[PDB]
Homo-oligomer: A and B are copies of this chain.
């Protein structure tokens, strides 16, 4: 028994369905907010946007690596939360994406 992601994630097309939405986020006027906050948010979204190809390649690589590695286990697996939880900060994720 194994856990497999949806087929829309392995070919990495859904990332485009992400980016388009993010692109809409760059069109609205951002009312009830100062100009500087909008400027900073636009800077962040643009920095993440210009690296679209890097994100696509990273996601496809992650999907393939997960499938190939996980196909090498021979004990049943279940999706049940356990007591001890893994700690992971998001700054490392930002570094990986950049």
Contacts and interface: CB of A to CB of B under 8 A. Distances in A.
A25 B32 CA distance: 7
A39 B39 CA distance: 13
A26 B37 contact: no
Contact of A49 (B23, B32, B42, B43): B32
Copies of this polypeptide in the complex: 2
Interface in A24-48: 25-27, 31-37, 39, 42-43, 45-46
B34 A36 contact: no
Contact of A42 (B25, B26, B34): B34
Interface of A: 23, 25-27, 31-37, 39, 42-43, 45-46, 49
